[PDB]
Amino acid sequence: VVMEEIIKKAFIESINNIRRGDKEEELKKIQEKIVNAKKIVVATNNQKKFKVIRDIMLRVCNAEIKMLDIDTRFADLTRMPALTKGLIALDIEKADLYIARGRLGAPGSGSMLVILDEKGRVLTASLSPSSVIHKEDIEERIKKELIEALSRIGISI
Amino acid sequence: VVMEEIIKKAFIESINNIRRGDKEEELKKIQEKIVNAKKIVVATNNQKKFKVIRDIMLRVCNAEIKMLDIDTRFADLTRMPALTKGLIALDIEKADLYIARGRLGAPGSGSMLVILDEKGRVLTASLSPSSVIHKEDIEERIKKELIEALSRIGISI
Amino acid sequence: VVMEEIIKKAFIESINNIRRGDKEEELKKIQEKIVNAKKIVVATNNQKKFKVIRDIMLRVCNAEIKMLDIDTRFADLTRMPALTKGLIALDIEKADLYIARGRLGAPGSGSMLVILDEKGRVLTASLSPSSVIHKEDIEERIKKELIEALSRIGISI
Amino acid sequence: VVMEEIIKKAFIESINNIRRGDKEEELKKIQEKIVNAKKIVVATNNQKKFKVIRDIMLRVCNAEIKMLDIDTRFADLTRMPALTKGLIALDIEKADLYIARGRLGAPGSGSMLVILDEKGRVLTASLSPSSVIHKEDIEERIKKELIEALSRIGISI
């Protein structure tokens, strides 16, 4: 059924104080939105990071997958750069799925990879430690982030 | 040495396109804010969950630690409930540090634990799968959330 | 062209410092979005307030106009309640246009009427003082808010 | 009497449905914060725009009034540029009051002047039509915006 209807029931449950965790139908919908996506925009300009994300997502959906034409480094001026990058992509690209990776919050907070639907809803996300504290090959780090973000909502790669 | 001056310089690196990841100085400030915290507000009404968070943070700070007087279940109507709870606590309680736990994003997106400073900046966070995807005792999960949120920015428990 | 391309151009102008205020085409896009809207959701339960908003918007578009099924008073816990109400409506109802009215910001900040498109972009808005500073019949107040929000982007009813 | 405590009472009124518009005490607090402000930061680099805002605030308060070291035009990549500018200033400058002016929402949506307190709360704001809709010397526009923003919360120039 439609996402708006699934969310409506959840909002009502919360209003009437019977909300007890996520529902099965909610997780299937998130899975369905990701899986049945036809267009994905990855909010990055770095071609390496894009390859990894693209190669991964090509295994779970049959979608046209695109990189961002403009420099999103300016999202690092906002409080949560990763969401900002995703919303930037939402504003300049028509798509079913937006995947953005950048800093979590304040300088020093490390990185977030986030996945948004066509309305900018946060479907899933994953975090990584600061590179100051724990340096790692960025190809393996993104690979692990994407894997967690997908597996935590029931999609296994 | 004040946070504002460090973030400024980080913002300048992004503006002039020389920003290449987080800095050591940035990490120390975040560590300082959390470690030297004297007043902490936990944006929850669940006394169990508060107990776990309080006990953990007392191992890293000598701080007066308080729970929220009001029901934050209404935050679950927003796009990112966990963050909303923190900003609610920020709005009605004076404190050095704010810790909030709730839904990540949309229904089904699992849970987020966040730590905010006195200006609502995002210092660090952690994520967990929905109990639908992975069941777990909520006391051990929350303990795991806080420890990761602390450890990913270099704070040992 | 599509909204996504118009915004892309504007963003490019700001990044590369050729942006000098809004463009004429950008203005037409917002107007077109309001006029050709086929489904409108008013984020309220107040049927009185709904009447005024519905009747006015029927003067500018031939659209299905709907009221919110749920209580949006809990948005008043957020930093900007009116926007929150729009985003709540956006989450649980499929529509071309979302119109929300509520508190601007902090308690005392007065009221905001905001209009959002299907992706939650802010197309236009208008404000009113707290009834503390200037009392007014709420039906004329809202009618006044809506007309200005429409007139400020060049739409006369 | 402290702002967090008045907001708590307001939040409680909204939660248990006793909230009936803004209260007198709330507006006095916003007035105090603005009038008794000791440090004000204007989120701009434009000395003309800074002059007007500074000139105006000097008639209502005796405050140190400062301009931003960095260019906040990149806030135009976010969904609500004026607010983003305010939060950029909040992140990199210690102050009692933050005044930001920029675009309201999407391209074409016109301009917003907003005033934030030291925790990033929206105290008051004003809007202007796009310069496409009504041309005006920007010095008179900003002056009219600020004056509208102050009088609507009860502060006269």
Side-chain angles (χ1 to χ4, degrees):
Chain A
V1 79
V2 125
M3 176 58 95
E4 284 73 13
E5 297 187 29
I6 289 177
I7 299 181
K8 198 205 207 79
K9 300 192 288 182
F11 281 8
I12 294 178
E13 286 180 333
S14 296
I15 287 179
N16 298 129
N17 204 9
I18 53 179
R19 181 75 180 173
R20 181 181 174 164
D22 298 338
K23 292 259 170 272
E24 281 291 342
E25 183 180 342
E26 299 160 355
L27 280 136
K28 286 183 181 181
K29 195 65 190 177
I30 291 182
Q31 288 165 7
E32 164 176 0
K33 281 211 156 184
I34 299 181
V35 163
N36 298 128
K38 281 47 191 172
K39 216 293 192 72
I40 295 178
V41 173
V42 183
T44 184
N45 306 99
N46 199 289
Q47 294 177 345
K48 291 186 180 81
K49 308 188 174 177
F50 172 75
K51 283 192 301 156
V52 176
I53 294 169
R54 169 185 127 273
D55 291 334
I56 296 297
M57 295 303 298
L58 279 169
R59 295 179 61 96
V60 326
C61 66
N62 188 29
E64 176 182 329
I65 297 180
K66 186 163 180 298
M67 188 172 48
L68 253 205
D69 280 27
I70 72 174
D71 194 5
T72 37
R73 76 165 175 267
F74 307 104
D76 292 337
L77 302 176
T78 67
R79 291 197 142 186
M80 307 188 66
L83 279 311
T84 300
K85 294 180 171 179
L87 290 173
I88 282 172
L90 174 63
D91 267 349
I92 71 178
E93 284 286 340
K94 259 166 168 57
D96 298 318
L97 261 194
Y98 300 90
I99 298 175
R101 199 220 109 101
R103 193 178 65 232
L104 198 212
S109 56
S111 295
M112 164 184 265
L113 184 146
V114 69
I115 300 183
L116 309 32
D117 73 352
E118 8 78 78
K119 286 184 164 184
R121 304 182 183 103
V122 173
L123 303 181
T124 185
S126 61
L127 310 176
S128 292
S130 173
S131 300
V132 167
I133 262 49
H134 183 264
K135 275 177 179 55
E136 184 178 16
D137 170 25
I138 184 63
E139 283 173 280
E140 285 296 323
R141 173 168 284 173
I142 288 165
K143 174 193 185 180
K144 292 193 307 183
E145 287 166 8
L146 234 185
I147 285 172
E148 188 179 7
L150 293 181
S151 83
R152 67 185 295 277
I153 44 95
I155 289 182
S156 179
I157 190 60
Chain B
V1 74
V2 309
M3 249 285 239
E4 285 73 13
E5 205 70 24
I6 291 177
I7 299 181
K8 198 206 210 79
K9 299 192 286 182
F11 283 7
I12 294 178
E13 285 182 332
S14 295
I15 287 179
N16 297 129
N17 203 7
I18 55 179
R19 180 74 180 173
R20 186 176 290 183
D22 296 338
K23 290 217 169 308
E24 186 160 350
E25 183 180 343
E26 298 159 354
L27 241 292
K28 288 183 182 181
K29 196 63 189 176
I30 294 182
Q31 285 168 6
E32 160 179 358
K33 282 209 156 183
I34 304 180
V35 162
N36 299 130
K38 288 299 134 74
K39 217 294 191 72
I40 296 178
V41 170
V42 183
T44 186
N45 305 99
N46 198 289
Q47 295 178 346
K48 291 185 181 288
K49 308 189 174 178
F50 170 74
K51 283 190 299 157
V52 177
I53 292 169
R54 168 181 53 82
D55 295 334
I56 295 295
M57 294 303 297
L58 280 171
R59 295 180 62 96
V60 57
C61 339
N62 188 30
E64 176 182 329
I65 301 179
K66 186 161 70 176
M67 188 172 48
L68 252 206
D69 280 28
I70 69 174
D71 193 5
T72 37
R73 68 166 165 109
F74 311 103
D76 294 337
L77 301 177
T78 71
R79 233 86 184 280
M80 305 188 64
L83 283 175
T84 298
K85 295 180 171 179
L87 290 174
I88 284 171
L90 172 64
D91 268 350
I92 73 177
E93 285 289 340
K94 218 84 176 306
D96 297 321
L97 214 68
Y98 300 92
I99 295 175
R101 200 226 177 225
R103 195 186 311 136
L104 205 213
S109 56
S111 296
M112 164 184 265
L113 182 145
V114 225
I115 301 183
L116 315 175
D117 73 352
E118 9 90 43
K119 286 184 164 185
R121 304 182 182 104
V122 173
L123 301 181
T124 186
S126 59
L127 309 174
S128 292
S130 174
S131 57
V132 165
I133 262 49
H134 181 83
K135 274 181 177 56
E136 185 176 15
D137 171 49
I138 190 63
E139 283 175 280
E140 284 298 323
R141 171 170 282 171
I142 288 165
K143 175 193 291 287
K144 177 213 74 167
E145 286 166 8
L146 230 195
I147 290 172
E148 187 180 7
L150 294 181
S151 83
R152 66 185 294 277
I153 43 97
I155 288 183
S156 180
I157 208 62
Chain C
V1 295
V2 310
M3 242 287 199
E4 284 72 12
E5 200 68 25
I6 289 178
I7 297 181
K8 198 207 208 80
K9 298 190 286 183
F11 281 6
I12 290 177
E13 284 178 330
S14 294
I15 293 177
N16 297 125
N17 204 8
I18 44 181
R19 182 74 179 172
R20 186 179 291 182
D22 297 338
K23 288 260 172 272
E24 188 159 351
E25 182 182 343
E26 299 160 353
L27 235 316
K28 289 181 183 181
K29 194 63 190 176
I30 299 182
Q31 285 169 6
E32 162 176 359
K33 279 211 155 184
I34 295 182
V35 164
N36 298 129
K38 289 300 135 74
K39 217 293 191 71
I40 293 178
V41 170
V42 184
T44 185
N45 305 99
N46 199 290
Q47 295 177 347
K48 296 184 183 81
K49 308 190 174 178
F50 173 73
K51 284 188 299 80
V52 177
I53 294 170
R54 172 182 56 83
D55 293 336
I56 293 295
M57 295 304 298
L58 279 171
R59 298 181 64 95
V60 333
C61 63
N62 189 30
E64 176 182 329
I65 298 180
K66 186 163 179 297
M67 189 174 49
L68 251 204
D69 280 28
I70 72 174
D71 192 5
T72 39
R73 70 160 147 106
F74 312 109
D76 293 338
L77 300 177
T78 64
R79 296 284 255 210
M80 310 191 69
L83 283 173
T84 300
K85 294 178 172 178
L87 291 172
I88 282 172
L90 172 63
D91 266 350
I92 68 178
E93 285 288 340
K94 258 166 167 58
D96 296 320
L97 261 193
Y98 301 92
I99 298 175
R101 199 220 94 113
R103 195 187 313 135
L104 203 200
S109 54
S111 295
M112 164 185 265
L113 182 145
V114 71
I115 304 182
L116 314 175
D117 71 352
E118 2 77 61
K119 285 184 164 184
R121 304 181 182 103
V122 177
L123 302 182
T124 187
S126 60
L127 313 175
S128 290
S130 172
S131 57
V132 165
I133 257 48
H134 182 81
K135 274 179 178 55
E136 185 176 15
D137 172 50
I138 187 63
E139 283 174 280
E140 287 298 323
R141 171 95 96 192
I142 288 164
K143 177 193 293 287
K144 174 210 73 167
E145 286 166 8
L146 219 190
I147 287 172
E148 187 182 7
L150 293 181
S151 83
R152 66 186 295 276
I153 45 169
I155 291 182
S156 181
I157 86 280
Chain D
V1 76
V2 81
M3 179 60 95
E4 10 289 306
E5 206 68 24
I6 112 178
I7 295 180
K8 198 206 208 79
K9 300 193 287 182
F11 280 7
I12 292 178
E13 286 180 333
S14 295
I15 287 179
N16 296 272
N17 205 7
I18 332 164
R19 182 74 181 173
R20 187 177 179 163
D22 298 338
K23 291 219 170 308
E24 291 294 339
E25 181 182 342
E26 298 160 353
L27 282 105
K28 285 183 181 181
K29 197 64 189 176
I30 297 182
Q31 286 165 5
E32 162 178 359
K33 283 210 157 184
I34 301 181
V35 164
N36 297 129
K38 290 300 135 74
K39 215 293 192 71
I40 301 177
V41 170
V42 185
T44 184
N45 307 96
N46 199 289
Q47 294 177 345
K48 293 185 182 289
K49 308 188 175 177
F50 171 74
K51 283 190 300 157
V52 179
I53 294 169
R54 171 180 192 271
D55 294 334
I56 292 297
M57 295 304 300
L58 281 171
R59 286 66 90 96
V60 339
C61 66
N62 188 30
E64 176 182 329
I65 300 179
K66 187 161 70 177
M67 189 174 49
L68 252 205
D69 279 27
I70 70 174
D71 193 4
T72 37
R73 77 165 174 268
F74 309 108
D76 293 337
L77 302 179
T78 66
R79 291 198 141 187
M80 305 189 65
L83 282 175
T84 299
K85 294 179 172 178
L87 289 171
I88 284 172
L90 173 62
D91 266 347
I92 73 178
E93 286 287 340
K94 259 166 169 58
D96 297 320
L97 262 195
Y98 300 86
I99 296 176
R101 199 227 177 225
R103 191 175 64 234
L104 192 224
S109 53
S111 296
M112 164 186 264
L113 182 144
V114 73
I115 303 183
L116 314 177
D117 72 351
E118 12 75 71
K119 284 185 162 185
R121 305 180 182 103
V122 176
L123 303 182
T124 188
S126 60
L127 310 174
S128 291
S130 173
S131 56
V132 170
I133 264 50
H134 182 262
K135 276 179 178 56
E136 185 174 14
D137 172 25
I138 191 153
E139 283 175 279
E140 283 297 323
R141 174 176 285 168
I142 288 166
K143 175 193 292 287
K144 290 192 306 183
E145 286 166 7
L146 221 187
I147 287 172
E148 188 179 8
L150 292 181
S151 83
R152 66 185 294 277
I153 40 96
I155 293 182
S156 180
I157 198 62

